[PDB]
Design a protein around this motif. Structure first.
Motif, PDB file in Angstrom:
ATOM      1  N   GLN A  22      -7.248   2.959  12.892  1.00 21.40           N
ATOM      2  CA  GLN A  22      -5.411   3.097  13.212  1.00 21.40           C
ATOM      3  C   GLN A  22      -3.945   2.075  12.836  1.00 21.40           C
ATOM      4  O   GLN A  22      -3.467   2.300  12.501  1.00 21.40           O
ATOM      5  N   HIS A  23      -4.470   0.698  13.858  1.00 20.83           N
ATOM      6  CA  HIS A  23      -3.263   0.340  13.723  1.00 20.83           C
ATOM      7  C   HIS A  23      -3.621  -0.834  12.512  1.00 20.83           C
ATOM      8  O   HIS A  23      -2.752  -1.052  11.998  1.00 20.83           O
ATOM      9  N   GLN A  24      -5.182  -1.263  11.626  1.00 21.95           N
ATOM     10  CA  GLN A  24      -5.244  -1.934  10.394  1.00 21.95           C
ATOM     11  C   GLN A  24      -4.558  -1.212   9.699  1.00 21.95           C
ATOM     12  O   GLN A  24      -4.445  -1.485   8.205  1.00 21.95           O
ATOM     13  N   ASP A  25      -4.897   0.526   9.434  1.00 22.29           N
ATOM     14  CA  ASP A  25      -4.386   0.893   8.579  1.00 22.29           C
ATOM     15  C   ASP A  25      -4.066   1.324   8.217  1.00 22.29           C
ATOM     16  O   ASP A  25      -2.630   0.910   6.645  1.00 22.29           O
ATOM     17  N   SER A  26      -2.563   1.142   9.034  1.00 20.03           N
ATOM     18  CA  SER A  26      -0.972   1.485   9.368  1.00 20.03           C
ATOM     19  C   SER A  26      -0.258  -0.501   8.903  1.00 20.03           C
ATOM     20  O   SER A  26       0.440  -0.288   8.235  1.00 20.03           O
ATOM     21  N   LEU A  27      -0.705  -1.239   9.777  1.00 18.93           N
ATOM     22  CA  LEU A  27      -0.986  -1.992   9.449  1.00 18.93           C
ATOM     23  C   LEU A  27      -0.528  -2.937   7.840  1.00 18.93           C
ATOM     24  O   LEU A  27      -0.280  -3.232   6.564  1.00 18.93           O
ATOM     25  N   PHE A  28      -1.800  -2.153   6.831  1.00 19.04           N
ATOM     26  CA  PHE A  28      -1.768  -2.750   5.600  1.00 19.04           C
ATOM     27  C   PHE A  28      -1.520  -1.882   4.739  1.00 19.04           C
ATOM     28  O   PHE A  28      -0.645  -1.801   3.166  1.00 19.04           O
ATOM     29  N   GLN A  29      -0.724  -0.444   5.522  1.00 19.94           N
ATOM     30  CA  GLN A  29      -0.356   0.593   5.117  1.00 19.94           C
ATOM     31  C   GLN A  29       1.742  -0.376   4.388  1.00 19.94           C
ATOM     32  O   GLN A  29       1.928   0.127   3.060  1.00 19.94           O
ATOM     33  N   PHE A  30       1.920  -1.013   4.789  1.00 19.57           N
ATOM     34  CA  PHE A  30       3.325  -1.574   4.293  1.00 19.57           C
ATOM     35  C   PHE A  30       2.523  -2.904   3.638  1.00 19.57           C
ATOM     36  O   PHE A  30       2.256  -4.200   4.077  1.00 19.57           O
ATOM     37  N   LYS A  31       3.015  -3.220   2.770  1.00 13.66           N
ATOM     38  CA  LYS A  31       3.226  -4.408   1.978  1.00 13.66           C
ATOM     39  C   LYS A  31       4.845  -4.300   1.572  1.00 13.66           C
ATOM     40  O   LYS A  31       5.695  -3.912   1.103  1.00 13.66           O
ATOM     41  N   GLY A  32       4.587  -6.712   1.540  1.00 16.68           N
ATOM     42  CA  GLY A  32       5.213  -6.553   1.054  1.00 16.68           C
ATOM     43  C   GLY A  32       5.885  -7.493   2.010  1.00 16.68           C
ATOM     44  O   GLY A  32       5.698  -8.165   3.268  1.00 16.68           O
ATOM     45  N   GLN A  33       7.503  -8.877   1.982  1.00 19.61           N
ATOM     46  CA  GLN A  33       8.132  -9.163   2.621  1.00 19.61           C
ATOM     47  C   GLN A  33       9.289  -8.908   3.230  1.00 19.61           C
ATOM     48  O   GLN A  33      10.168  -9.023   2.181  1.00 19.61           O
ATOM     49  N   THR A  34      10.258  -9.431   4.191  1.00 21.62           N
ATOM     50  CA  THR A  34      11.722  -9.117   3.985  1.00 21.62           C
ATOM     51  C   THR A  34      12.397 -10.290   4.355  1.00 21.62           C
ATOM     52  O   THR A  34      13.643 -10.552   4.251  1.00 21.62           O
ATOM     53  N   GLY A  35      11.411 -11.786   3.907  1.00 19.32           N
ATOM     54  CA  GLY A  35      12.142 -13.261   4.290  1.00 19.32           C
ATOM     55  C   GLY A  35      11.244 -14.204   5.173  1.00 19.32           C
ATOM     56  O   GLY A  35      11.543 -15.229   5.636  1.00 19.32           O
ATOM     57  N   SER A  36      10.170 -12.879   5.916  1.00 18.35           N
ATOM     58  CA  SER A  36       9.611 -13.610   6.736  1.00 18.35           C
ATOM     59  C   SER A  36       7.756 -14.306   6.621  1.00 18.35           C
ATOM     60  O   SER A  36       7.219 -13.267   6.113  1.00 18.35           O
TER      61      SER A  36
END
Lengths: 109, 51
Positions: A22-36
């Motif tokens: 679940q943690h890995q899936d949640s991490l992969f769900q969010f794509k992109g970057q905000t400046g970091s």
């Protein structure tokens, strides 16, 4: 799609949650970057590979340094209470079998 | 004017050198300038140090 998938989707989602991180899936769900730097897919997998053990350690620490939780205790002892809850009854019956009537009802001692 | 290859190379080599000069000037200014990366370019993935 209107009479089967709506009722079948929850079952498949539960199966996938059980069989996937679940943690890995949640991490992969969010794509992109905000400046970091480090929000790319490659870094997230590398982070999650260690976050497995990190989360294990954090849960163990919480069970020790925080007030015990009924849900956590039940999760820890799920097998003894969920799937193998009849072994308690069978052990009690065996212990009391000396002074019971089961030996006369098609059961050995 | 004997056109033996070795002696003919006297006339050919200067022109070949000029053409090579033009080609290498073009290659340095555009080809490498647009395709190559200097100073060991690479992708870095950071990871936080966990508790």
């Amino acid at each position: 799609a209107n009479f089967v998938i709506p009722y079948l989707k929850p079952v498949a989602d539960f199966w996938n949650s059980l069989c996937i991180d679940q943690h890995q899936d949640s991490l992969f769900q969010f794509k992109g970057q905000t400046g970091s730097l480090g929000t790319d897919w490659t870094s997230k997998y590398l982070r999650s590979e260690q976050d497995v053990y990190n989360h294990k350690y954090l849960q163990y620490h919480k069970r020790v340094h925080e007030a015990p939780e009924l849900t956590d205790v039940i999760s820890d002892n799920v097998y003894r209470l969920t799937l193998f809850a009849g072994v308690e009854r069978v052990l009690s019956v065996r212990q009391a079998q000396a002074i019971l009537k089961t030996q006369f009802a098609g059961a050995t001692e | 004017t004997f056109g033996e290859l070795q002696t003919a190379d006297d006339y050919l080599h200067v022109l070949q050198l000029r053409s090579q000069n033009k080609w290498v000037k073009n290659y340095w200014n555009r080809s490498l300038q647009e395709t190559g990366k200097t100073n060991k370019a690479h992708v870095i993935s950071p990871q936080e140090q966990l508790r």
